[PDB]
Design an enzyme around this catalytic site. Structure first.
Site, PDB file in Angstrom:
ATOM      1  N   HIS A 234      -7.339   9.201  -2.426  1.00  0.00           N
ATOM      2  CA  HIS A 234      -6.676   9.076  -1.487  1.00  0.00           C
ATOM      3  C   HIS A 234      -7.834   9.903  -0.562  1.00  0.00           C
ATOM      4  O   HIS A 234      -8.186   9.025   0.556  1.00  0.00           O
ATOM      5  CB  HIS A 234      -5.687   9.829  -1.339  1.00  0.00           C
ATOM      6  CG  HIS A 234      -4.906   9.389  -0.059  1.00  0.00           C
ATOM      7  ND1 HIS A 234      -3.134   9.510  -0.475  1.00  0.00           N
ATOM      8  CD2 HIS A 234      -5.103   9.154   1.066  1.00  0.00           C
ATOM      9  CE1 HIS A 234      -2.468   9.200   1.010  1.00  0.00           C
ATOM     10  NE2 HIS A 234      -3.627   9.453   2.038  1.00  0.00           N
TER      11      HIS A 234
ATOM     12  N   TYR B 280       2.729  10.020   0.302  1.00  0.00           N
ATOM     13  CA  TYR B 280       3.942   9.579   0.944  1.00  0.00           C
ATOM     14  C   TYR B 280       5.222   9.386   0.151  1.00  0.00           C
ATOM     15  O   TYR B 280       5.738   9.003   1.140  1.00  0.00           O
ATOM     16  CB  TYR B 280       3.384   7.141   1.138  1.00  0.00           C
ATOM     17  CG  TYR B 280       2.529   7.335   1.303  1.00  0.00           C
ATOM     18  CD1 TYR B 280       1.778   8.388   1.585  1.00  0.00           C
ATOM     19  CD2 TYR B 280       2.157   6.302   0.737  1.00  0.00           C
ATOM     20  CE1 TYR B 280       0.094   8.096   2.723  1.00  0.00           C
ATOM     21  CE2 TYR B 280       0.820   5.223   1.920  1.00  0.00           C
ATOM     22  CZ  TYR B 280       0.078   6.567   2.256  1.00  0.00           C
ATOM     23  OH  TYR B 280      -1.236   5.613   2.911  1.00  0.00           O
TER      24      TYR B 280
ATOM     25  N   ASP C 134       1.246  -1.145   0.266  1.00  0.00           N
ATOM     26  CA  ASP C 134       0.048   0.104  -0.022  1.00  0.00           C
ATOM     27  C   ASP C 134       0.770   1.264  -0.032  1.00  0.00           C
ATOM     28  O   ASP C 134       2.070   1.475   0.979  1.00  0.00           O
ATOM     29  CB  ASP C 134      -0.868   0.270   1.086  1.00  0.00           C
ATOM     30  CG  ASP C 134      -1.667   0.940   1.140  1.00  0.00           C
ATOM     31  OD1 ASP C 134      -3.125   0.746   0.249  1.00  0.00           O
ATOM     32  OD2 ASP C 134      -1.763   1.750   1.385  1.00  0.00           O
TER      33      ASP C 134
ATOM     34  N   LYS D 286      -2.191   5.973  -4.974  1.00  0.00           N
ATOM     35  CA  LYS D 286      -4.266   6.757  -4.196  1.00  0.00           C
ATOM     36  C   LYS D 286      -3.455   8.142  -4.678  1.00  0.00           C
ATOM     37  O   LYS D 286      -2.766   8.472  -5.171  1.00  0.00           O
ATOM     38  CB  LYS D 286      -3.659   7.015  -2.516  1.00  0.00           C
ATOM     39  CG  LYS D 286      -4.171   6.024  -2.176  1.00  0.00           C
ATOM     40  CD  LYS D 286      -4.262   5.836  -0.491  1.00  0.00           C
ATOM     41  CE  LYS D 286      -3.834   4.491  -0.028  1.00  0.00           C
ATOM     42  NZ  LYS D 286      -2.460   4.166   0.637  1.00  0.00           N
TER      43      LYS D 286
END
Ligand SMILES: NC(=O)c1ccc[n+]([C@@H]2O[C@H](COP(=O)([O-])OP(=O)(O)OC[C@H]3O[C@@H](n4cnc5c(N)ncnc54)[C@H](OP(=O)(O)O)[C@@H]3O)[C@@H](O)[C@H]2O)c1
Ligand SMILES: CC[C@@H](C(=O)O)c1ccc(-c2ccc(C)c(F)c2)c(C(F)(F)F)c1
Length: 319
Positions: free
Chosen positions: A116, A54, A49, A83
């Protein structure tokens, strides 16, 4: 193998029921995401994931590439999630955002592409756009048009499956009731743990053939930016700790197994080799029905992420 158990999604694709969480705070050097994603694949994680937010898709993509090159895994054995970040909700921005994530990770497709969050932010380069008074700048986007752009990404083969994240029931129904809908979301990735078990949302998603994917299933990383230090620590819960002793496991393993037995796909983040390998032992044991009811009783409606920057957004999913 039991460790590679999967759930069939409503578009025919399959998703491994245990996934590796890759987010680490920006004070963690990016070299770690590379190292620990390799460790996760070595341990037997196949669902990974990630997200544009990130700042690690390059390292996660490098780890996948490395484990393909040494013969540990094929690309087809890996389920990779990315995402769409909230500054890219406007429909003309969706496909270029996905293609940029693919370029960073050096992948040809993602197995899963998610919205997201429903909380749209001002389009631009900055991930956290802010005004002169420091407040994050909101945007207003009809998320049905965002979803139409996601559907085009699936038809283009760039995403095998598409889904959403942090949607509540009202926001999910808005997509499901959309005129001319081509693809339902395969999943809704939400905060879910014994202190916030989302049973109501889970029952709704089950009735629609939508998989609930649990994040912060181990109680979150308790980042000071968003988590109240006085909130209870999930893994110190007396019930979870007693269950861990009875089963000769750990409180984390109890929390992960709870989700698997109620039909939730569960994520687990660890940047520690020994905890990464411990987390795959979730397939080795089972909670009794009475254990499950005990954990069901722990719900406190506690979302660890709490901030008036979220709560003031018109699309804030909680209340
Ligand atoms: N869609 C979204 O908006 C959203 C939001 C939040 C998270 N996520 C995703 O879900 C993933 C997981 O959620 P999360 O980041 O909040 O973390 P989490 O899975 O709830 O884990 C929290 C902490 O548990 C520790 N841990 C892991 N295994 C353990 C074990 N066996 N025993 C004791 N402690 C253990 C880890 O610390 P160590 O690293 O030191 O092991 C980790 O920092 C994220 O990384 C991200 O991929 C998505
Ligand atoms: C920083 C870690 C990151 C991740 O690991 O994904 C993350 C964690 C939590 C949330 C979040 C918070 C509050 C609410 C109401 C929400 F719906 C989502 C978001 C999001 F979606 F806002 F970007 C992102």
């Amino acid at each position: 193998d039991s460790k590679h158990q999967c759930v069939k999604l409503n578009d025919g694709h399959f998703m491994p029921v245990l996934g590796f969480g890759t987010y680490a705070p920006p004070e963690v050097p990016r070299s770690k995401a590379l190292e620990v994603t390799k460790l996760a694949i070595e341990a037997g994680f196949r669902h990974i994931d990630s997200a544009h937010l990130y700042n690690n898709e390059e390292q996660v993509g490098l780890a996948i590439r490395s484990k393909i090159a040494d013969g540990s895994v094929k690309r087809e054995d890996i389920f990779y999630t990315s995402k769409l970040w909230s500054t890219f909700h406007r429909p003309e921005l969706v496909r270029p955002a996905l293609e940029n994530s693919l370029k960073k990770a050096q992948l040809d497709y993602v197995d899963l592409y998610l919205i997201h969050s429903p909380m749209s932010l001002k389009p631009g380069e900055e991930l956290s756009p802010t005004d002169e008074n420091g407040k994050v700048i909101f945007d207003i986007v009809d998320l049905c048009t965002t979803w139409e752009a996601m559907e085009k990404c699936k038809d283009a083969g760039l995403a095998k499956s598409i889904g959403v994240s942090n949607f509540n029931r009202r926001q999910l129904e808005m997509i499901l009731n959309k005129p001319g809908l081509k693809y339902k979301p395969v999943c809704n990735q939400v905060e879910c743990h014994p202190y916030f078990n989302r049973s109501k949302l889970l029952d709704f998603c089950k009735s629609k053939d939508i998989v609930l994917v649990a994040y912060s299933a181990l109680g979150s990383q308790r980042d000071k930016r968003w988590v109240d230090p006085n909130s209870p620590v999930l893994l110190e819960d007396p019930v979870l700790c007693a269950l861990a002793k009875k089963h000769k496991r750990t409180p984390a393993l109890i929390a992960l197994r709870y989700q698997l037995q109620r039909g939730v796909v569960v994520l687990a983040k660890s940047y520690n080799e020994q905890r990464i390998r411990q987390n795959v032992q979730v397939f080795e044991f089972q909670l009794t029905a009475e254990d499950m009811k005990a954990i069901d009783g722990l719900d406190r409606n506690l979302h660890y992420f709490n901030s008036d920057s979220f709560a003031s957004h018109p699309n804030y999913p909680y209340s």
